[PDB]
Amino acid sequence: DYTLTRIDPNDRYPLQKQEIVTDPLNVFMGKLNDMVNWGRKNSIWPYNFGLSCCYVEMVTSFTAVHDVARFGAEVLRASPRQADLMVVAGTCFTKMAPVIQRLYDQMLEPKWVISMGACANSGGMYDIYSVVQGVDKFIPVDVYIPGCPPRPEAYMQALMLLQESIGKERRPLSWVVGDQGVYRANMQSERERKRGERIAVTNLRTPDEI
Amino acid sequence: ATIHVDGKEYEVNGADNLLEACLSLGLDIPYFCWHPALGSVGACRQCAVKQYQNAEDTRGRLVMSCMTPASDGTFISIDDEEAKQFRESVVEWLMTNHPHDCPVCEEGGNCHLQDMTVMTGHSFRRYRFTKRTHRNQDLGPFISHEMNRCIACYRCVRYYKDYAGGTDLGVYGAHDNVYFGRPEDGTLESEFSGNLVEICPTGVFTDKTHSERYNRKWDMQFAPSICQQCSIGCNISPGERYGELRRIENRYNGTVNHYFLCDRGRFGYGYVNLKDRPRQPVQRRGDDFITLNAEQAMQGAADILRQSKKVIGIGSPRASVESNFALRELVGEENFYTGIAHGEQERLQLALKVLREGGIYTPALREIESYDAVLVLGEDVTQTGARVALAVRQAVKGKAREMAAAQKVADWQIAAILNIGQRAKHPLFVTNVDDTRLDDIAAWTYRAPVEDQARLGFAIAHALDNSAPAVDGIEPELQSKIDVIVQALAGAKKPLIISGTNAGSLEVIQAAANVAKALKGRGADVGITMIARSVNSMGLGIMGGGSLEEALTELETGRADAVVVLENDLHRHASATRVNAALAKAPLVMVVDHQRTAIMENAHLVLSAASFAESDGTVINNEGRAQRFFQVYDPAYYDSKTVMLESWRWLHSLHSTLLSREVDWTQLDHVIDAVVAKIPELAGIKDAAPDATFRIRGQKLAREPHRYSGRTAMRANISVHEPRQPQDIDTMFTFSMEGNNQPTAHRSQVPFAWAPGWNSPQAWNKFQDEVGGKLRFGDPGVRLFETSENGLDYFTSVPARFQPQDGKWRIAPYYHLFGSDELSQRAPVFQSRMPQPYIKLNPADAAKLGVNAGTRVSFSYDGNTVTLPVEIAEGLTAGQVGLPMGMSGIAPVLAGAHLEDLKEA
Amino acid sequence: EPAWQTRDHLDDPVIGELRNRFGPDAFTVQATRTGVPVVWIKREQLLEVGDFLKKLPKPYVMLFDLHGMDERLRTHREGLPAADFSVFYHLISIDRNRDIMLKVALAENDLHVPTFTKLFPNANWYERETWDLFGITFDGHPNLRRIMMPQTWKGHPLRKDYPARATEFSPFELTKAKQDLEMEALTFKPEEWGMKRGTENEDFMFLNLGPNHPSAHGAFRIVLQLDGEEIVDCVPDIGYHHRGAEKMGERQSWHSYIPYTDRIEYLGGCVNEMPYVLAVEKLAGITVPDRVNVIRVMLSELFRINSHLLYISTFIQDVGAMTPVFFAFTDRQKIYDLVEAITGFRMHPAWFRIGGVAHDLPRGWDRLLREFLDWMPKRLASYEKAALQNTILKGRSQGVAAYGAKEALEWGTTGAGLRATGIDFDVRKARPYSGYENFDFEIPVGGGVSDCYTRVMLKVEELRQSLRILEQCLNNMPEGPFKADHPLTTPPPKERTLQHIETLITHFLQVSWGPVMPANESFQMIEATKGINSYYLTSDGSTMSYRTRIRTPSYAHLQQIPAAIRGSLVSDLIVYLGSIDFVMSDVDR
Ligand SMILES: CCCCCCCCCCCCCCCCCC(=O)OC[C@H](COP(=O)(O)OCCN)OC(=O)CCCCCCCCCCCCCCCCC
Ligand SMILES: CCCCCCCCCCC1=C(C)C(=O)C(OC)=C(OC)C1=O
Ligand code: SF4
Ligand code: SF4
Numbered sequence A: 001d002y003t004l005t006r007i008d009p010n011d012r013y014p015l016q017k018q019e020i021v022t023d024p025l026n027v028f029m030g031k032l033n034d035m036v037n038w039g040r041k042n043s044i045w046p047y048n049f050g051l052s053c054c055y056v057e058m059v060t061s062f063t064a065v066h067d068v069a070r071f072g073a074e075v076l077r078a079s080p081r082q083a084d085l086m087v088v089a090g091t092c093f094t095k096m097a098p099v100i101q102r103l104y105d106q107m108l109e110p111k112w113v114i115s116m117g118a119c120a121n122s123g124g125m126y127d128i129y130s131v132v133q134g135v136d137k138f139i140p141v142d143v144y145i146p147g148c149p150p151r152p153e154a155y156m157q158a159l160m161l162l163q164e165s166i167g168k169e170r171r172p173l174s175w176v177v178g179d180q181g182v183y184r185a186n187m188q189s190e191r192e193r194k195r196g197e198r199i200a201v202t203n204l205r206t207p208d209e210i
Numbered sequence B: 001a002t003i004h005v006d007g008k009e010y011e012v013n014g015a016d017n018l019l020e021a022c023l024s025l026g027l028d029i030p031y032f033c034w035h036p037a038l039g040s041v042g043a044c045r046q047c048a049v050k051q052y053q054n055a056e057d058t059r060g061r062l063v064m065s066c067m068t069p070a071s072d073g074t075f076i077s078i079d080d081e082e083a084k085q086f087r088e089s090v091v092e093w094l095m096t097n098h099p100h101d102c103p104v105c106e107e108g109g110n111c112h113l114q115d116m117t118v119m120t121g122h123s124f125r126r127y128r129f130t131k132r133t134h135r136n137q138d139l140g141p142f143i144s145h146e147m148n149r150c151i152a153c154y155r156c157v158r159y160y161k162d163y164a165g166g167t168d169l170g171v172y173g174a175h176d177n178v179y180f181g182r183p184e185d186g187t188l189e190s191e192f193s194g195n196l197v198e199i200c201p202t203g204v205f206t207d208k209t210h211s212e213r214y215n216r217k218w219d220m221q222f223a224p225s226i227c228q229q230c231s232i233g234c235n236i237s238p239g240e241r242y243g244e245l246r247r248i249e250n251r252y253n254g255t256v257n258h259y260f261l262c263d264r265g266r267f268g269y270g271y272v273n274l275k276d277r278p279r280q281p282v283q284r285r286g287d288d289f290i291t292l293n294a295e296q297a298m299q300g301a302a303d304i305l306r307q308s309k310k311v312i313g314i315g316s317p318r319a320s321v322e323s324n325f326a327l328r329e330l331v332g333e334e335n336f337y338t339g340i341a342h343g344e345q346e347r348l349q350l351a352l353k354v355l356r357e358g359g360i361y362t363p364a365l366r367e368i369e370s371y372d373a374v375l376v377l378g379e380d381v382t383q384t385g386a387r388v389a390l391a392v393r394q395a396v397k398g399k400a401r402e403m404a405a406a407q408k409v410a411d412w413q414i415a416a417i418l419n420i421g422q423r424a425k426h427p428l429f430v431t432n433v434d435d436t437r438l439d440d441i442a443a444w445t446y447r448a449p450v451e452d453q454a455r456l457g458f459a460i461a462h463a464l465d466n467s468a469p470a471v472d473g474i475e476p477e478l479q480s481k482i483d484v485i486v487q488a489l490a491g492a493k494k495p496l497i498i499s500g501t502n503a504g505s506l507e508v509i510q511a512a513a514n515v516a517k518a519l520k521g522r523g524a525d526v527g528i529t530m531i532a533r534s535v536n537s538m539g540l541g542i543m544g545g546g547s548l549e550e551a552l553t554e555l556e557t558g559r560a561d562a563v564v565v566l567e568n569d570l571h572r573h574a575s576a577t578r579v580n581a582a583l584a585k586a587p588l589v590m591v592v593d594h595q596r597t598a599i600m601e602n603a604h605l606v607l608s609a610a611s612f613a614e615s616d617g618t619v620i621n622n623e624g625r626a627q628r629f630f631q632v633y634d635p636a637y638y639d640s641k642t643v644m645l646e647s648w649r650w651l652h653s654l655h656s657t658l659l660s661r662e663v664d665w666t667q668l669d670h671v672i673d674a675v676v677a678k679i680p681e682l683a684g685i686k687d688a689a690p691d692a693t694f695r696i697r698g699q700k701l702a703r704e705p706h707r708y709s710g711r712t713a714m715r716a717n718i719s720v721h722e723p724r725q726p727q728d729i730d731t732m733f734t735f736s737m738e739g740n741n742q743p744t745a746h747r748s749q750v751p752f753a754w755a756p757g758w759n760s761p762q763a764w765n766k767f768q769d770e771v772g773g774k775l776r777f778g779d780p781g782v783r784l785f786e787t788s789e790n791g792l793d794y795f796t797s798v799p800a801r802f803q804p805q806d807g808k809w810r811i812a813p814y815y816h817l818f819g820s821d822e823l824s825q826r827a828p829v830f831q832s833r834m835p836q837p838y839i840k841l842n843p844a845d846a847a848k849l850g851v852n853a854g855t856r857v858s859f860s861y862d863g864n865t866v867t868l869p870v871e872i873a874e875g876l877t878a879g880q881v882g883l884p885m886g887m888s889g890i891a892p893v894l895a896g897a898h899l900e901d902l903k904e905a
Numbered sequence C: 001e002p003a004w005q006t007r008d009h010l011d012d013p014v015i016g017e018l019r020n021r022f023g024p025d026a027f028t029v030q031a032t033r034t035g036v037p038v039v040w041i042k043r044e045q046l047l048e049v050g051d052f053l054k055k056l057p058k059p060y061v062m063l064f065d066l067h068g069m070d071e072r073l074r075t076h077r078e079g080l081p082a083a084d085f086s087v088f089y090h091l092i093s094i095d096r097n098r099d100i101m102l103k104v105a106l107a108e109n110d111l112h113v114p115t116f117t118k119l120f121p122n123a124n125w126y127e128r129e130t131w132d133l134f135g136i137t138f139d140g141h142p143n144l145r146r147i148m149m150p151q152t153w154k155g156h157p158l159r160k161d162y163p164a165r166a167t168e169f170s171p172f173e174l175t176k177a178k179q180d181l182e183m184e185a186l187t188f189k190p191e192e193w194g195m196k197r198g199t200e201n202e203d204f205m206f207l208n209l210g211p212n213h214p215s216a217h218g219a220f221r222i223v224l225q226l227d228g229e230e231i232v233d234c235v236p237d238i239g240y241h242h243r244g245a246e247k248m249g250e251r252q253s254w255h256s257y258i259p260y261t262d263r264i265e266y267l268g269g270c271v272n273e274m275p276y277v278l279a280v281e282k283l284a285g286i287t288v289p290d291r292v293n294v295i296r297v298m299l300s301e302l303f304r305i306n307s308h309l310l311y312i313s314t315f316i317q318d319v320g321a322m323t324p325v326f327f328a329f330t331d332r333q334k335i336y337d338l339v340e341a342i343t344g345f346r347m348h349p350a351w352f353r354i355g356g357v358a359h360d361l362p363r364g365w366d367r368l369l370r371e372f373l374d375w376m377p378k379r380l381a382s383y384e385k386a387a388l389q390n391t392i393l394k395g396r397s398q399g400v401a402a403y404g405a406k407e408a409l410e411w412g413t414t415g416a417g418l419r420a421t422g423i424d425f426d427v428r429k430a431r432p433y434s435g436y437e438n439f440d441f442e443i444p445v446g447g448g449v450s451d452c453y454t455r456v457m458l459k460v461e462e463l464r465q466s467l468r469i470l471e472q473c474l475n476n477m478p479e480g481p482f483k484a485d486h487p488l489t490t491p492p493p494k495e496r497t498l499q500h501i502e503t504l505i506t507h508f509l510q511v512s513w514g515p516v517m518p519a520n521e522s523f524q525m526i527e528a529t530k531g532i533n534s535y536y537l538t539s540d541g542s543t544m545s546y547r548t549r550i551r552t553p554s555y556a557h558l559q560q561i562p563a564a565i566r567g568s569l570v571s572d573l574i575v576y577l578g579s580i581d582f583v584m585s586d587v588d589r
């Protein structure tokens, strides 16, 4: 119930091959991989990249009234090499899609992508000539956030979802020994999981109340 | 005449009332009860304007702009405070009893009452009491009835009675309890009841077929097209949603079908949305059924075509000009066969010869309404060419219009028009094998076999001009009736002669041509009108070819080892057994069609063609007017597996792959240029509509309204990535709202009517130079031929008197509006509307056979002992059996044929 | 007599001087609902009219706007000269407190206008934008290149025949060849601007600061030439944040365009909403009640406090102190709690409507407003005493990128910079909109120079004035309707929609097809959180806007940037970028 991606530059972005494979997981190697995944998911360094409104809401989440620092994700490096997470928070404009592609290429694996906002998910409200309809047209996105703008705790919830995704994924421990393909778990969708608690809602508070 | 609106000087037509005088200039006055075609009755009291007789007048008077003539020197104010307050009060009074039904209403966003509620600026309700309610009647499978929404504007009764001639819709009730409908429940039996869904300003009469699978007007994707259900070619606006044809709306053509369609063309669209239709190319190996896409199917078809010595092609009068021409150029000029039989093709060639060679001007459908005396020979118009019957009714009421105009009554005072002309009306003489639906207004009805109708026509032609060939042996009573018809036709000013190929005889058309020639020789402006059977019968006759019998005998003799059947069922023009034998004998049958025909079991290859909603093309109507019908939607947008292409595109790619082993999907303009190059007499179809490079200030024309909804979610179930919208390389339209649909654009092809503040079918007022007249910048479609300088001679071959032979029964055709079209009977909504198949017998012959009505009589035609229940027809002449054409197992080719072995079983 | 009536404006003295100078047959006067004298002037006399307005006794020293228009599809052009295209120049005389709009008519083939760059130096970017979006060529322009779209772009986006939606065109497939071509097109080529790469002794080095720089506040790229540390010249490259909102105004209805107007400046919100809905109410003929004016003023001041708090925190962080931004965002969270209570959303409320607001105020908003008004001034004093009185911040800020009144006028600078240069031209006082005459609040005016520090403390005083306005609104609040009773009020009141049929009809036709504004022309200029924001709406009588023009102050500030940072350091450029209060959505729209 996993998937495998293998990357190779040498036509159409993304330059990768994905297939549906089975989890291979080893009395010590499995615990070693679990420890590596724990260390990776408990320390994420997001990239200081911003496009639009959604970046302003992301750095609103970065502040002292929500404190995403508690998850170890406040480091916010401005260099792609030092970063460990690309949060596309804003509109993927036509003139910036090469820039975003370049900044994704300068980043180093282990790398993850979080689309924030409707513009980054699908193009959003701007079905216009000068906007790429969704940032996933050329880069693989790990976690999607609906919203315009998503509230800061929605970004925090997406960060925790990315942490659960990292905690159950298989990556090569060393680049000299073993397979270099990336295994990502095909987790159950949050829509299916939350259908049990969402349909049962009966009464809400009327809008005239504060 | 010159009028003054708010100080502005306008030049108007002085013979018109003020309402459409202002509506022509683009001045907005709210109105309900007035219609451009019906007239003025002054009922709804919504069109109030403040009139001044002097240039310096303060008070004025609130007068009805639909009831006040637009004379020279009237100073009317529309946006005055008093007039605006009165119009708002009238809207409020109509809104006192109106139900809270707009979300659950089928005309939401298409409502005239909504437009005039927002137009007068009324949004506050101070009425606080109860609202009157009414029950609803079951008006049949077509019309959904909701009387609560009515405003008592009297348009339905006016149209249905004084225009359509129907008798079952009326006004009942009281002061405020006014009801509009039938005295009981039951189907509206008029053949023009479908126009009530657009005549009614409110949602009382609505389209039930549209109400089944309902979407709003802004959700519709529209296109301009031509109705395919018969030969008249009324312009329609098909609108689809979610990949299926949703609703056929009326399209304004000021020369053909201005405000009214018929029910067969309006509700007969259900065959397009059938799931049995072929959507992919399907190939057979024995009993194994596989699906291909376009390229491998084309390559395999070209291989098998190259492996045969002679490929023949059987066209159809249902398919367009370009597809038939593509088949003709694929199989060669000499190997192209028209799908009709020999008799139908002979009648069609004779009708075309009389039209484009007889020297008599055939009028358009709008021009029919002005002719004085009408003689219908043979053709049952109301069940075949119903719009011509409606125009005949208008031309009949023209006499009362003339006496009204003689008494200094303006033309829009329709109440005075029927007041002066109580029952006096123009002469109408119809001939048929039985009683028609035009018998209520006809001056005479002749119930006789086609030989006797032809002899009556020859007698009229001889008694007009003595050079015409005389028939001897007429009874003195029929001679007196002949003299009456002669006195009525000779004393007229614009006589009209209406015939067609649906009578089943050639001598009827010859007699009608002789009557028209005799009327022309006496110095009268005479017109003629032949009603064909299918939509593109006239174009197929113009192009020409062989008959179906010749194609079948080429298949049976073995000289044709490969047959391409284009959009033909082949059981409608020939016997099923002979067709099945000639198709099983042939080692390759390739059926290119959009419907699951019965011959597809014998087909070695099935090519999924496109219907009128999914294909572009040209069709030639019964008056020689070439008309272009456009595509409504791409079938592959929703179902991406669907390989469903235009038939001319299929045949042209097959021809290219047969020649040069390459697949070349062409464009419609190339095929149009090929037709107008190879065929001189089809050169007018280039001017039917402009090419795909036509732009209104650089942009294309929109197929969907500017507020089309759900672009990013209507395909999200399949994939969240919305693909590129389909590109229309063939025509000037686009499958998007990025286009021009302004009412003042320099174009003739209008997909739909919309103006800001005008959402109803009354939005067509902005698209015309004058309201009710021609379309602005000319009507679409051009005539293929002009009137000849000299005409034909006298057809001398008169027929003999009908003598009933014992044993053999002559088959009298009984055409029905719902059931005689090949594609309309496939609609599931027509199965609850069409009558049961009854064989019609004289009381004398039924008493001779001993059969009573209700019992079954079995008849054998080519080894088919088929049983039908018996209906008694008093008006049918003895020696004939009345059979409905176009039904299941009864082809229209059965007309005039004999019928042995007619026994009770 | 209402203020939205079509006023032909022959009573303006400028019309009289133009008639006496150029004769009675040189220009045409258009009657519009803009409140502006609209003068159709022949193309040959455009430079003469510009010089005449520049050399008046109380002259028009401001080029407010310069943009084209496609008139090929406008059906109702009565009283208007024949034109396929047009170019309008909106000019302001501050001392007169007046403004004029000069329109020149062009045919479809003869699309060349004399340049306006010599008279007003800020016309360069506007002429580039007009050439990019409409295809209109300006003769004598120095570098007529695209500023919104990339150089490898075919067609002009704001023309009527150009399709608007990305689903109409082919989807975005990024292949290696297209990536290489677009990456080479985005590469700075110094010979195209005459940069003179290098010198005879030592070479200049080119630096691309943006996009994605911690000091670049958005999608802004500046290409800066350095000799060591010193800046030689700057080439500010914009267009990396283009959303085509004007084409969306030609695409969406009157009611559905409100979220798009709201996202024009993502720190403005209701302040961005106000000029659009006011211009639409001018078009319809709607006079809003007092309670609507008070509610919209309150929301505008709340979002102004939010924007000024963000601007102060970003300036302090760009100087180097990373601490007060967290507390400033906590006060932003307080404002967000209040705005969530009222409008139901945090930062993009989409709450203003035609003729009113969406909902009424909920029961208890005064408690949250009291809590915020108690919370704010002590926090502001803490921020002042912690960072804004710091001598290191003063050294990094005072005297950095300073310009006089002539540079603030010739470059279109408005807001904090214009008031810091001593030009007391505030829209909330000179041309009061939305009932701003009923609120008492002072206007901060600087000493005559626009330092970074001067702009920052003027914005601090503007925040204090907005707090005063909020206090006055809270202590004195009307009790009336939240929507106008005009029939063109969109949407109608909800309860009358739910239990009346006329209101249901009006709501049904106003949300489906859109409200039908009559064929007229309207304009509304307001003081935004970052300067002066104006909406110019031409209606063809349909349910959409035939033309939507949005003038933003950050565009003029970004065009001013090379003239006020040339010769300085990169640190001075960073502080200047932090002390302009710009967002790239405002710049590129
Ligand atoms: C274990 C080791 C560490 C132990 C931790 C505790 C000690 C921490 C010490 C931190 C020292 C930080 C020093 C920062 C110096 C900055 C100097 C500077 O750049 O000043 C320039 C600035 C403007 O200069 P200006 O003359 O305006 O510009 C000329 C342009 N024409 O000039 C001005 O704005 C004028 C004022 C300059 C002030 C200079 C610094 C004063 C002393 C340091 C700050 C206080 C530290 C704590 C002291 C004890 C407190 C109990
Ligand atoms: C240091 C961790 C975040 C603190 C809180 C936010 C600090 C201010 C961010 C300002 C900013 C905005 C709004 C911004 O839009 C932007 O452009 C994308 C920046 O550059 C990366 C910015 O720096
Ligand atoms: S999704 Fe909304 S908030 Fe985010 S960048 Fe787009 S317009 Fe701005
Ligand atoms: S007929 Fe018109 S006004 Fe009446 S319920 Fe239907 S949409 Fe509403």
Ligand code: SF4
Pocket: B149, B150, B151, B152, B153, B154, B155, B156, B157, B180, B199, B200, B201, B202, B204, B205
């Ligand atoms: S049912 Fe319709 S057409 Fe008839 S009177 Fe009522 S509103 Fe008019």
Ligand code: SF4
Pocket: B227, B228, B229, B230, B231, B232, B233, B234, B261, B262, B263, B264, B265, B266, B384, B385, B386, B387, B388
């Ligand atoms: S008269 Fe014929 S062409 Fe016209 S709508 Fe009816 S079926 Fe169609």
Ligand code: FES
Pocket: B030, B031, B032, B033, B034, B041, B042, B043, B044, B045, B046, B047, B064, B065, B066, B067
């Ligand atoms: S339109 Fe004149 S009274 Fe009805």
Ligand SMILES: [Ca+2]
Pocket: B615, B616, B631, B728, B729, B730, B731
């Ligand atoms: Ca096509």
